[PDB]
């Protein structure tokens, strides 16, 4: 019936799942749902000079991602979050960079990279001690409230909230600072999920380790509650070089746990946990913006 999250995570990994289309040096920052029995994946793109976004043509097996069409969005949605918002029967794509710090668009057909509505403000606030400003938003609702979580490349995690009845809409400028640590420990790539079958929420945050990017996990009993470190060191990570089972990459970086239910609750099944992540060749160097990031999938070994 129900499974619990392990205290120690062990994964197996695919190899590189796809190469970027001509003109891109990287595929990045994945968000994914199952839509009509197929994997639906949005991501950031990089040409090395600037970031854009794209969607893969829907595919049934991860092993077929390599042949999936890669469809550029004509208006960039960097570091996107995709979900179905059930109370209004509408799909939401939230992202960073444009007229506001965070932005969203809506659609009745999430497979179309250019079928999204006019951009609307999601968040208009500002944070201190950050070179980036607000970065890597995610959205998650319980039964009562819609939450915004984000990072700032600065060791902090931030949260905002509104009643679900007021979403889709603008969180405005206000936020709460919920976590504070070193820049390395709480860097970016924050994601939050409901653990199916448990009275528990799961937060993962990307950290900069000695050996590469990795994820630290935290749990809470409430989205407005305190977060308790779970697998939160480089030696005992949520997912990292230590436990990924990946050979092609020493980095486990910005992605999304695989969500079978596409809705706003961001529910994951702890019995069948999988992680769509970005990784890169250990030999790749140079400017961050030119790094050859690629998609991979981790599968939890039970
Ligand atoms: O163009 C800007 C982007 O580059 C920026 O993205 C962040 C840039 O810094 C990255 O972190 C660095 C990785 O390499 C390490 O050696 C450095 O210490 C880190 O700072 C981070 O991963 C990116 O998200 O955002 C703002 C854009 O204008
Ligand atoms: Ca994200
Ligand atoms: Cl809040």
DSSP string, 245-301: --SS-S--EEEEE-BSS-BTT-EE-TTS-EEEEEE--TT--S-GGG---EEEEEEE-
First to last CA, the chain: 14
Pocket of ligand 1 contains residue 289 by CB under 6 Å: yes
79: left (phi over 0), alpha (psi -120 to 50) or beta: left
Question: Which residue, judged by its Cα, is nearest atom 5 of ligand 1?
Answer: 132
Pocket of ligand 1 contains residue 288 by CB under 6 Å: yes
CB atoms within 10 A of CB 84: 17
SS3 for 164?
helix
Tokens, residue 23:
């003109």
What was the elucidation method? X-ray
13 C-alpha to ligand 3 centroid (Å): 35
Residue of 50, 129, 153, 255 best suited for mutating to test ligand 1, as the one with most atoms within 8 Å of CB: 153
66 C-alpha to ligand 2 centroid (Å): 22
CA dist., res. 235 & res. 216, Å (int): 10
CA dist., res. 175 & res. 74, Å (int): 31
CA dist., res. 220 & res. 216, Å (int): 14
- The resolution of the experimental structure, rounded to one decimal in Å, is 2.0
87 C-alpha to ligand 2 centroid (Å): 22
In order of start, what are the domains of the chain with their CATH numbers? Answer: 1-302 (2.115.10.20)
CB atoms within 10 A of CB 3: 16
Question: Which residue, judged by its Cα, is nearest atom 9 of ligand 1?
Answer: 288
């Amino acid at each position: 019936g129900t499974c619990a999250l392990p205290s120690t995570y062990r994964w197996s990994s695919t190899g590189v799942l796809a190469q970027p289309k001509s003109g891109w040096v990287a595929l990045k920052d994945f968000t994914t749902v199952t839509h009509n029995g197929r994997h639906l994946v949005y991501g950031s793109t990089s040409s090395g000079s600037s970031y854009g976004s794209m969607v893969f043509s829907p595919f049934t097996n991860w092993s077929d991602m390599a042949s999936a069409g890669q469809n550029a969005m004509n208006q960039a949605a960097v570091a996107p979050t995709l979900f179905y918002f059930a109370p209004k029967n509408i799909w939401v794509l939230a992202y960073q960079w444009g007229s506001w710090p965070f932005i969203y668009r809506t659609s009745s057909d999430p497979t179309d990279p250019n079928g999204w509505s006019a951009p609307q403000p999601l968040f208009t606030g500002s944070i201190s001690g950050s070179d980036t400003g607000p970065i890597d938003q995610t959205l998650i609702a319980d039964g009562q409230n819609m939450y915004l979580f984000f990072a700032g490349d600065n060791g902090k995690i931030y949260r905002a909230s509104m009643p679900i009845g007021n979403f889709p809409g603008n969180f405005g400028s206000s936020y709460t600072t919920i976590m504070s640590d070193t820049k390395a420990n709480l860097f970016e790539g924050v994601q939050v999920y409901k653990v199916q079958g448990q009275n528990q929420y799961l937060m993962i945050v990307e950290a900069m380790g000695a050996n590469g990017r990795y994820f630290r996990s935290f749990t809470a009993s409430s989205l407005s509650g305190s977060w308790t470190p779970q697998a939160a060191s480089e030696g005992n990570p949520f997912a990292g070089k230590a436990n990924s089972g990946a050979t092609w990459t020493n980095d486990i970086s910005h992605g999304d746990l695989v969500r079978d239910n596409p809705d706003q609750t961001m529910t994951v099944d702890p019995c069948n946990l999988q992680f769509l992540y970005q990784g890169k060749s250990p030999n790749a160097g140079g400017d961050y913006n030119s790094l050859p990031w690629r998609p991979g999938v981790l599968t939890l070994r039970r």
